[PDB]
Design an enzyme around this catalytic site. Structure first.
Site, short mmCIF file in Angstrom:
data_model
loop_
_atom_site.label_atom_id
_atom_site.label_comp_id
_atom_site.label_asym_id
_atom_site.label_seq_id
_atom_site.Cartn_x
_atom_site.Cartn_y
_atom_site.Cartn_z
N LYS E 80 0.86 -1.16 0.00
CA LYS E 80 0.00 0.00 0.00
C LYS E 80 0.90 1.20 0.00
O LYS E 80 2.00 1.16 0.55
CB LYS E 80 -0.88 0.02 1.25
CG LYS E 80 -2.12 0.92 1.16
CD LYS E 80 -3.27 0.20 0.46
CE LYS E 80 -4.55 1.05 0.43
NZ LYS E 80 -5.74 0.29 -0.10
N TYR E 179 -25.95 1.12 -5.98
CA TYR E 179 -26.90 1.26 -7.07
C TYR E 179 -26.84 0.04 -7.98
O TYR E 179 -27.87 -0.54 -8.34
CB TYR E 179 -26.58 2.53 -7.88
CG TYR E 179 -27.58 2.86 -8.97
CD1 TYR E 179 -27.64 2.12 -10.15
CD2 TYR E 179 -28.46 3.94 -8.83
CE1 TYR E 179 -28.55 2.44 -11.17
CE2 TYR E 179 -29.37 4.26 -9.83
CZ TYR E 179 -29.41 3.51 -11.00
OH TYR E 179 -30.32 3.85 -11.98
#
Lengths: 356, 359, 356, 359, 356
Positions: E80, E179
């Site tokens: 990371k 969604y």
């Protein structure tokens, strides 16, 4: 024959005689010139009355390729392979694999393809042993599209206008290529006077293009602007010269002139002759386009370049005042020379049809 | 001639005819068999009375090389190049360069070297266009290597004709005192053997008598002499009806090619109980030596490798009395069987097979 | 067992026993012959009553591949892998990764694929450690298209005409492949007499092809020109031989002959038998087409070549006067020999299914 | 036998069975562990009373090699090849060629060398099909390298049994006067030590007494003598109930394999306070030497590298009294721990890890 | 901080602090573990109250990736990157080129992608200096398709049937992913109880899926079978635990559990919890698919595999009798171990996400 005498006389590079007892293979790879690059040319499989007859035929066709490929503006030399045998009988897988290994062993000095006797199926076997082959994976429309523009080049020459729309063309023979050429001559708007030994085919055309069938021996004088020999060769001879009503001779057939004389003189009559081995180039051009990943569209587009080369041919005659069939031979020699000169500057890795 | 008919008979692979007008290069490369690997054979440059005559010579020679290389235990096929032209006048840089290009073209199927009418200077020009060549001035004094080659082969000849390898003492008649001949003497004298020579060149014969305390004899008094070993090291056919009769030397081991003038002669000496180290096998240290250049030349390694001729000659004697046949026939049978044996063994699939060309 | 005795008797190349404790892997890679190239063959995962039983089974299937691949005209040798274990239970990722590394370590001498017990999902795991695998990324229609032409070859043999249109085919079994074969036999215009243990499937067919359902044991004598065994094997035995009304036996099933005898004699009756392991080749051919970038179209096209090979098989019988099942074994040995001979000429880098 | 059951027990990686009808090649390649890198182990060619008997021998041997190579501090796994056949009669070029092809096939997972019934001439044939082989005639007189190996190991034995590395003066009884044995003497005499030998060969014993001013003794009077170092350098099991009793030589350091006939014997000498340099570790200069050919052979480097046996033996003594266990058990534990330790260390990601195969 | 103490405690591999004065770049590349392969993980660009705070955050997220990537069944380690700075202001081209060179200098030990603060535009700059980057060239539906199946896996667990058709889902938040998830939950036939701070979005959904809008704080007890936290994290706490009427908790949000306790106990109530960092894996999986030539279809298909991994997670709990959030951590460690073991067999060139 005197192999070395024959070779030395025209500076042939190699005669690679290959043999495999078990598969019965007997091939003769002739490489005339490799100046422009690898020698490319098809392999003809036929029966020969004598060894050294096939040898000379191999050498003669190789030298023919170096000229055709040269004039076609390709970066390929001249080679050819003759396989002694009856294509219809003595063919077998091993025979072509063997041939393929030997081609692999010339490491790109020679590239093959089909010719009378060999097929796209044979090329596939070869391709099993080497990448130096073409005609694998219809080629007719392509070379057809080639005569189309070559004829265009004849038009602008004889009629001061490359537009053929309107004009009438006496098409001798109606095979795949001749048939395709018709479609082009048709959709551009022109009248056709087809013919051929095969009635059945004279049909397809008449019906599809609204063409008029005519007697095989009557095709030579018909009321047409252009005459397209697309059948057999030598059709341009003493008998046909006079008859000819057309102003131009542009066709797909090979060896269109029975004698050199025939050429020397039609050039007198002011007939516009598009040298055969050049106008029908679309054929070899097309197979060369496989070497860099085959693409019909590009192929069809490059073939369209015969228009310029044919033009260059007319320009040569109008220079040394020699007939087109002679302007051809000279244009190739000139290009080979010019390119050889240009590419003499050192480079660690120049390009070639083989470069990825 | 009928090339295709000649090639099919003994199954020749290729005949590569190369030409170059500007340099007058007329080259015939005959590839007989590439089963053991690339075809290796030197180029003989000479003048020929007829074209088909040189082509026949190349083919015959290539097939010779496929037997030699195979018998020699090398991993090379059989080839040979015949260049038609007078070696004393016709040579010129360009013709060899051109030659080298064409060889580069055969991409490793053919490897060249020296031979009659050819020199290492010739091999250096070819080397300017390709690696497929040996016997360059940078690689392979060879004479002593091949000489050390027959020396060990001769030792192999004993232990068969004398039950012992100790040539120590025993007399050897040597026909010719050339470079190889001379070196053969050196190894012999050293192990403490009696040497009796001969050779057209008096000085050569002279340097020999003084150098090894030899016993000079006449050109004809060499076939016949009191020695238990005959070393024909000059010209061939020296084993014929005029010399076979008055010999009685238990062994024959020399550097000369085509020692038997006819197959009959070998069939005879065999019957007469004379142990003969088949010529092309005992003198293979010549091709072995040039072969050693392919994997980076090393004389010292070529020499120790040529010692293998001993183990091989003795293998022929084994075959000789396995099918009970003269040693010249066992030689040819051994070669043929190693090719088939090796071909069989290497039919197992690999992605990157090893060859004398591997780096 | 006497591993070495078994291997020497038929000259097996290798027996690569691979093991990984943690993942519980136990695989046996048998490589019979690699003359034509890398050994290709699937990995069978099953439970074995004994170690050396799986060993012999592995060796037997490997030798079977060298014959199938040979006859199929492929450039692949014969190998096979047996993984001892219950496909339905003891399967896990590591096990197949481990197998994959070991295949990578044979560096192309072996190429694997699915077989009973292993799936396209397993091949994907393997493919994580090596490229020497196939059956990754439906294969049914392909091999189906293979029986189609093989049957065509049987037709022209028994009916002097490869056209099956009109003829009736007694289709035993209606699984994916059998189902597909039907579509071909249908769209060409032929009647089908389907059957199968699964009623539900006998439906799909009857409905889609207008076929007639028949009793499972009645399928052997129906009024049909060709009999297509596509169910289980050994269906051609003493009971079925007589019954048979069809002139030809052409089906997808394996081990179609219960005994060699059965073959020896149907050849007497003049029945046309398309050797099983050859006619159903479409299956292995298809997976081999992945090695050079999978392409369904080409695959489907190459499978169509079973027509010729089957023909070659008939040609061999009519030569040594031996039944087709024997003509098969002999045709493969002959090809392996012929190719080995042809490819003995030196080359620095010959081609192979692995060459890019 | 139950191969899969035997393999899983100690987690053997592979058993590659290779065959070639035409040459009679019956080869068993056992790969035990390739964690440290390719598996390296020579091929033992011998005759076996049963098939499963040779397969068992190969597996047992491969796992032996994974302990040796690991203890030796080399980056190689454990493998071994057993070829069934009579080494004195059955050998033939093709069988080794075939062998080499299959090894090429294992693409670097297995590397071969010499062993009982095998020779460098054998290794040269294999080398014609693959690079995955060592102990060729071009690479690795080794005897002195491994000898220089036990010499330093023996010095390591001292400084443990005498608190000092100076073998200078101290007496050493040497069983056997073979090539290695002879070279071990040379290093000893040089540092000015008293040498007492023995060996069936009187001449060998003779060349030794004169060469180093030795003190020849009888075959049985060697286990017992007045020397503070016993060098068993002939046959194994020489440390048993019949010899352990009458020894009292503070140290044992020899070239012989399997010195202890039973694990008990080691458990005893340990208790008896005799410092013992575990056989397969002190004599590893043999495998170390052939290993050095992989990265371009250099004897002088092999010799300086074999000196590392000293630092390693002394490491075993450290482990010996870390878990308080006989030195033969500490040897096996050290090997096991280096593998796990090294495996752990190399689990960090790299695009092109280094191996003995890296160029 | 005590960098080395922090690293040693969990055996972190590296902390590569990179700096470029001119472009103002300050990046911290943390690489926790690379056992499964290159460390892959996005670069977060944010403002940090202290140097060594960003350091610890970088280390913590790296270690988080090694677990996520592990559990996701990917062959990638855990890394990371944190870039200290305000994404909205102090961003410039050179800064990312510089970062890119440094990534090129770790030669594949680290592979980056976007994370909060960085965009597909930043990745493009990086890609100018190295190939070790992803998220270049919408990713929402992909990870959306991931929760879909993960939820399926929750269903078959809680309702003995992976079919969600019929059931009602309490969807918290209605962003791009939430969604998309809805569309799946819809076309399969299920009722949705959407919500969100953004009224406008609650629209798009209600209108498109015929969903019922509900109070933001009422979304926790609605009459639904499954609860899909797709908004912010820590939504599963002391307040929400009781309320919860749904039998399953399956959502896209990160850090779904405010405290470990929360997990320990919902596991008591028999609630089916699909560990957050695993069910939302579709996100990282998708970016990894670029490493081998991005392909949405395959990506979408591999994401579907969360169904099995989630299942494996339930199987672990039913083994050591520990809650799912604990079964996750353990499943990754186990895979990392199992794979490390399997791949310890020598190979000259093993594969990896970087192999062409």
């Amino acid at each position: 024959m005197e192999i070395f005498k024959y070779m030395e006389h025209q500076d042939y590079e190699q005669l690679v005689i290959c043999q495999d007892k078990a598969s019965g293979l007997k091939a003769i790879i002739a490489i005339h010139d490799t100046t422009l690059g690898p020698a490319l040319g098809g392999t003809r499989m036929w029966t020969y009355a004598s060894e050294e007859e096939a040898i000379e035929d191999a050498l003669r066709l190789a030298r023919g390729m170096t000229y055709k490929n040269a004039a076609a503006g390709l970066n390929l030399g001249g080679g050819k392979t003759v396989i002694i045998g009856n294509p219809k009988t003595d063919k077998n897988d091993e025979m072509f694999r063997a041939f393929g290994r030997y081609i692999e062993g010339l490491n790109g000095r020679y590239i093959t393809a089909e010719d009378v006797g060999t097929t796209e199926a044979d090329m596939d076997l070869i391709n099993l042993e080497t990448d130096y082959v073409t005609g694998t994976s219809n080629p007719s429309p392509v070379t057809a599209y080639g005569i189309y523009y070559g004829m265009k080049a004849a038009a602008k020459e004889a009629f001061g206008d490359d537009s053929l729309a309107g004009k009438t063309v006496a098409v001798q023979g109606v095979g795949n290529v001749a048939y395709a050429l018709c479609e082009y001559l048709h959709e551009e708007g022109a009248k056709l006077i087809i013919t051929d030994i095969n009635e059945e085919a004279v049909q397809r055309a008449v019906d599809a293009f609204g063409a008029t069938a005519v007697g095989i021996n009557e095709i030579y004088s018909q009321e047409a602007d252009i005459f397209a020999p697309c059948a057999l060769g030598a059709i341009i001879n003493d008998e046909t010269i006079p008859q000819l009503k057309a102003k131009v001779i542009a066709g797909s057939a090979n060896n269109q002139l029975k004698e050199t004389r025939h050429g020397d003189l039609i050039h007198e009559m002011g007939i516009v002759y598009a040298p055969d081995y050049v106008i029908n180039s679309g054929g070899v051009i097309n197979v060369a386009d496989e070497l860099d990943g085959y693409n019909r569209e590009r192929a069809l587009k490059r073939v369209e370049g015969i228009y310029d080369v044919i033009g260059k041919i007319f320009a040569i005659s109008k220079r040394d005042n020699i007939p087109t069939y002679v302007a051809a031979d000279r244009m190739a020699e000139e290009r080979i020379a010019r390119v050889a000169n240009t590419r003499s500057t050192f480079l660690q890795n120049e390009k070639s049809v083989l470069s990825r």
